[PDB]
């Protein structure tokens, strides 16, 4: 009972007693990037209502939509041609994926069920292969690990492991206590961090079952959360107009990017290939670009007239894909 | 010759202008995504409308009142060219106010009947049917019978007056306005019964407001085309006191008439949200 | 129940290395990788796939 | 210089293209309505999660989400765009009164829900009847202000009803009416209707005050309202 209060001052000063210096006075020696110019190459037309998930492949081609019309299309980035356009059950969804090896397509919603959809197919047309339905909460987003497991976080306070084959679930976190909105996996695919609605983050591990480490230090809801290239950190985005950066080994924070002319919320987090470009997409209906190791704002990618709900880099560092509400996609090199 | 002159000046300054500001307006219809509506395409064919009147119909009109002397056809060309493009704008305008009709009047199934097929279809054959009035002296409602005076380039050496009354005041013209009289008047009486009931001193000044702004609309229609077809209509049914007018009398009255080209972006699209925010926007970024 | 306080303990045990080791180590990844990133410094056109 | 690859993928885009210019006309010509209330409030039989229905040649669609959880505060950004929302709220059950006030006190004032208009329906009146003019009655315990409550003269009696049901329904019609009017201005309204277990007009309801709105929002666009 009154054993907690004491365990978490004791956690409270041994993360201080580590503390040395402040990215700050490390970093007040290399030169500023400077300023960022960047243009719409593609736009890409073809839904009706807002567009919620976006997902780029493997090859750096082929990219996935989801809308609010219950259909997900698959694009080509180069020839702005139209592949698949897969018609769903639920109209509401707010999620997508797309498989590692390009042959599967995942979605979910406000149904509570995760779909798994094939592509290469022996008849030239796209079935339902199999639909989980264990969770007792609206789905929020689902990530695959290889062809035959997947991750879901949804809106009952859990995260869930799956056996594609088997059709139920492996393993289940349930460590939290508002709904989960964002989570993200790792390069090394054996760790995956997770973001829920009461204002703290978590990693997880996939075959120990059990919670590792927290991190607190927002004051509202977490929305979107992203991963490093190395492995080693972690940026997260919060309604307080608020980004802030958590390293892994040291349990603390490291960084914090906010302005004070955004009011709005924050919907989306990326990072570029090299892990020195931070992407943001906020609710005055434009995004943000942030150095992540100095603080400084390089440039606005203004192009949209609503909400932006959607980000992307690719594997290869070409481009980056943004999707808003009013139903178009943009390119941006 | 100073009035002469002074009415080519005036002609020239309203061309410029009318030109100007509907070119601005297709423009920004052009460059906006939000703006593609079925509602707006109407309004892109009335700025088109007016271009065409600005950019070929003003110089046609002043070369034909200077007054040379050349063949029968070819300054028959000129007056039909003419007639063509204003009656496309009268019936753009009839387009504008059966949309507003449809839009308020009936507005659950505003959407199923107003698309963008049938909004191309109706711009189609609104702009066919003024071709085709517009050439119909051709088939031989003419004057070359007694030729004028190898003719001098006046119209009304070549048009005559029964055309330009029965056809195309009492055919073209009229059924227009009162149309556009009688689907305001409903449109007023429907909002002030909503204004009595929403309000249950401030409900009689909106109902004032409401009344004005629709009220404008039909004014500046009507001061624009009566006068100009007033004169032949006084010329044609009595001839003793058309044959001694004042000559300045029918100019002041065409300019007018042109005058139209060049409020018709005022009334209808700067008043309107989406164009405002639209402009709004590209003066900030740009 | 009791199990915050179970969970505690071995977020208690973990160890923590300096703030400054990190910082070293992602300058050093940051400055390391800077010579395939398209997006802090253009590509010539004619390699580019989006024109 | 274009392979037939190239073609054959053209010719597959133009027949997914026209697929959805083919869907996109049934889209457009839908109104959609967002269904809302409480466990033990008869949602279920008004017009379990979907419900397509015409009128006048008029389709409409209610949507009824209950697997979430009391807090709703996430889901509900997504129906920004829906034309109105319905809310069922009970009658007989009396102690089971504030808390459903409060929550439409949640909706009203919803950042995400600021230019959509709630149609209310007060259903399970047959019950209220019996409870009132049976002694069992004690609105004044749970309600002090209705002991001292006027019967409004504005008010259209149904012939043959005592007028204790009348002061019983009416009180409980203004006391939404109040936290309706409380907030608010020219964005968004409410109406009121009285609703039976069996009742067969309500489809007639929700295509007039369904009118109504779309015909103020017209309105408004042109700034004459
Ligand atoms: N009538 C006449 C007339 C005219 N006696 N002279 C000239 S030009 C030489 C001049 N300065 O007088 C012109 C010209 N332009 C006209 C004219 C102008 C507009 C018209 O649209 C009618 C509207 C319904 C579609 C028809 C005719």
């Known amino acids: ?333 | ?286 | ?51 | 210089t274009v392979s037939a690859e190239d073609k054959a993928a053209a010719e597959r885009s133009k027949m997914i293209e026209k697929q959805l210019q083919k869907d996109k006309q049934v889209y457009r010509a839908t109104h959609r309505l967002l269904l809302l209330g409480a466990d033990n409030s008869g949602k279920s039989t008004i017009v379990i999660f979907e419900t397509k229905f015409q009128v006048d040649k008029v389709n409409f669609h209610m949507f009824d989400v209950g697997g979430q959880r009391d807090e709703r505060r996430k889901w509900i950004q997504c129906f920004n765009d829906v034309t109105a929302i319905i809310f069922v709220v009970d009658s007989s059950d009396y102690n089971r009164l504030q808390e459903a006030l409060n929550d439409f006190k949640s909706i009203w004032n919803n950042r995400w829900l600021r230019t959509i208009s709630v149609i209310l329906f007060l259903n399970k009146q047959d019950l209220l009847a019996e409870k009132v003019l049976a002694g069992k009655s004690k609105i004044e315990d749970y309600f002090p202000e209705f002991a001292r409550y006027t019967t409004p003269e504005d008010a259209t009696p149904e012939p043959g009803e005592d007028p204790r049901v009348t002061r019983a329904k009416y009180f409980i019609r203004d006391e939404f009416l109040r936290i309706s009017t409380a907030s608010g201005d020219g964005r968004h309204y409410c109406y009121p209707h009285f609703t039976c277990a069996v009742d067969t007009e309500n489809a007639r309801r929700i295509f007039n005050d369904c009118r109504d709105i779309i015909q103020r929002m017209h309105l408004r666009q042109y700034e004459l309202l």
């Open chain 3, 1 to 51: 129940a009791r199990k915050l306080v179970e969970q505690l303990k071995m977020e208690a045990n973990i160890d923590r290395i300096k703030v400054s080791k990190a910082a070293a180590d992602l300058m050093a990844y940051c400055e390391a990788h800077a010579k395939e990133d398209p997006l802090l410094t253009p590509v010539p056109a004619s390699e580019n796939p989006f024109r």
């Open chain 1, 1 to 333: 009972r009154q054993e907690a209060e004491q365990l978490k001052n004791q956690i409270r000063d041994a993360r201080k007693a580590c503390a040395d210096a402040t990215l700050s006075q490390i970093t007040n020696n290399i030169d500023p990037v400077g300023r960022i110019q960047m243009r719409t190459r593609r736009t890409l037309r073809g839904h009706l209502a807002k567009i919620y998930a976006m997902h780029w492949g493997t090859d750096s081609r082929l990219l996935v939509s989801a809308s609010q019309d219950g259909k997900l299309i698959i694009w080509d980035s180069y020839t702005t041609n139209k592949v698949h356009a897969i018609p769903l059950r639920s109209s509401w969804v707010m999620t997508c994926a797309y498989a590692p090896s390009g042959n599967y397509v995942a979605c979910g919603g406000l149904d509570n069920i995760c779909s798994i959809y094939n592509l290469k197919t022996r008849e030239g047309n796209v079935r339902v292969s199999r639909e989980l339905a264990g969770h007792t909460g609206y789905l929020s987003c689902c990530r695959f690990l290889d062809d035959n497991q997947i991750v879901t976080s949804s809106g009952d306070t859990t995260c869930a492991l799956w056996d594609i084959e088997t059709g139920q679930q492996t393993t289940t976190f349930t460590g939290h206590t508002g709904d989960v909105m964002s989570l993200s996996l790792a390069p090394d695919t054996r760790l995956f961090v997770s973001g829920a609605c009461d204002a703290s983050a978590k990693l997880w591990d996939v075959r120990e079952g059990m919670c590792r480490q927290t991190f607190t230090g927002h004051e509202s809801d977490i929305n979107a959360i992203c991963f490093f290239p190395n492995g080693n950190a972690f940026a997260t985005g919060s309604d307080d107009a608020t980004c802030r950066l958590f390293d892994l080994r040291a349990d603390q924070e490291l960084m914090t990017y906010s302005h004070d002319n955004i009011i709005c919320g924050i919907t989306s987090v990326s990072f570029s290939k090299s892990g020195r470009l931070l992407l943001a997409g906020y609710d005055d209906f434009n995004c943000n670009v942030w150095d992540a190791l100095k603080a400084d704002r390089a440039g606005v990618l203004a192009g949209h007239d609503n909400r932006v709900s959607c980000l992307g880099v690719t594997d290869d560092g070409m481009a980056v894909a943004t999707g808003s509400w009013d139903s178009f996609l943009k390119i941006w090199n």
């Open chain 2, 1 to 286: 010759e100073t009035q002469d002159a002074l009415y080519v000046a005036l002609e020239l300054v309203i061309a410029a202008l009318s030109v100007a500001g509907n070119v601005l307006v297709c423009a920004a219809v052009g460059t906006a995504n939000t703006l593609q509506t079925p509602t707006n395409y109407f309004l892109v064919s009335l700025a088109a409308a007016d271009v065409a009147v600005g950019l070929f119909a003003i110089p046609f009109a002043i070369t034909i009142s200077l007054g040379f002397c050349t063949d029968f056809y070819g300054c028959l060309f000129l007056a039909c060219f003419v007639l063509v493009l204003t009656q496309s704008s009268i019936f753009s305008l009839l387009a504008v106010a059966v949309d507003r009709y449809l839009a308020i009047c009936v507005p659950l199934r505003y959407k199923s009947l107003v698309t963008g097929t049938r909004a191309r279809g109706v711009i189609a054959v609104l702009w066919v049917l003024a071709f085709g009035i517009g050439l119909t002296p051709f088939l031989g409602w003419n004057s070359k019978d007694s030729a004028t005076n190898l003719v001098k380039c006046l119209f009304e050496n070549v048009v005559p007056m029964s055309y330009m009354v029965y056809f195309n005041f009492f055919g073209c013209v009229l059924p227009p306005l009162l149309i556009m009289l009688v689907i305001y008047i409903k449109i007023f009486l429907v909002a002030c019964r909503q204004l009595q009931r929403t309000e249950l001193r401030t409900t009689l000044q909106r109902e004032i407001h409401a009344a004005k702004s629709l009220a404008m609309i039909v004014g500046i229609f009507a001061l624009c085309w009566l006068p100009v077809h007033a004169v032949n209509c006084v010329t044609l049914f009595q001839p003793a006191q058309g044959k001694n007018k004042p000559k300045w009398a029918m100019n002041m009255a065409i300019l007018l008439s042109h005058a139209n080209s060049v409020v018709n972006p005022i009334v209808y699209a700067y008043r309107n949200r989406d164009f405002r925010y639209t402009f709004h926007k590209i003066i900030s970024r740009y």
